[PDB]
Write a protein that binds this ligand. Sequence first.
Ligand SMILES: CC[C@@H](CNc1ncnc2[nH]cnc12)NC(=O)CCC1CCCCC1
Length: 167
Amino acid sequence: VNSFSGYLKLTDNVYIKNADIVEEAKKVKPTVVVNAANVYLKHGGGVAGALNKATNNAMQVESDDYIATNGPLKVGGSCVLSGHNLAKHCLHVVGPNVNKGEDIQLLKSAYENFNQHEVLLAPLLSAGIFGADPIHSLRVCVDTVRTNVYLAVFDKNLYDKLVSSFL
Ligand SMILES: CC[C@@H](CNc1ncnc2[nH]cnc12)NC(=O)CCC1CCCCC1
């Protein structure tokens, strides 16, 4: 038993809620919150800009030191950093950005990072400003992630859609 509330159960291991991941994060203090990162860890907008703002820019300061030491992530890759005031850890995961021409096949590789963590609070990778179809993203999530994932879909119209079309 864990502390997530109000989720709809999609499969054995995937759950979905209409929620603001920042607010869900501040209430659950999950062990892991997933950020929809880019390779430079420049958290300017979307989920990343919201998570970072909620940390009063501490996420960005930590991220800039990470990049200065290690260089950029790979598309499809990830790193574990602090969760600051939102979670124990933040798993920064880079899904492909269709608005940058990146290969959508890398979305499966991105979701594979979730399997290194038993339970995660996460957004749909490559959704929103990353330009992928959130329904395809949900299908890849369900078919790739084997650990327990709690998906927060900020928008209500899209949520209800994702549920109604789910196979
Ligand atoms: C689907 C991916 C999410 C990712 N963003 C966040 N997800 C969770 N919590 C957040 N807090 C701040 N941002 C988020 N994007 C949206 O819902 C934007 C609206 C839809 C409307 C339909 C077409 C695609 C864009």
